[PDB]
């Protein structure tokens, strides 16, 4: 019964087929690789509030 190990080693190539099968079976996702470089947050502006355009006559 020693030939079990010999047979498994010799026939091990079929695991490539098994890998292809499980690859086809598995669902897939992916990445949108993130950007670095938010090193400078930006404020709005120097903003001053005032009454609008008065309509004089």
Partner 1 sequence: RTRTVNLYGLPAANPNNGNEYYEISGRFSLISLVPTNDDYQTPIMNSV
Residues engaged in binding partner 1 (CB under 8 A): 30-35, 37
Question: Between 24 and 45, whose beta carbon lies closer to partner 1?
Answer: 45
Closest separation in Å from C-beta 9 to partner 1: 37
Retrieve residue 41's tokens: 């947050």
Question: Between 27 and 37, whose beta carbon lies closer to partner 1?
Answer: 37
Closest separation in Å from C-beta 34 to partner 1: 7
What CA–CA distance (Å, rounded) separates 24 from 17?
A: 11
- Answer positive or negative: Cα dihedral of 5, 10, 15, 17: negative
Retrieve residue 9's tokens: 């080693």
């Amino acid at each position: 019964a020693s030939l079990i190990y010999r047979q498994l080693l010799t026939n091990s190539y079929s695991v490539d087929l098994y890998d292809e099968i499980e690859q086809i079976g598995s669902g897939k996702t992916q990445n949108v690789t993130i950007n670095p470089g938010p090193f400078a947050q930006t404020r709005y502006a120097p903003v001053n509030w005032d009454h609008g355009e008065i309509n004089d006559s």
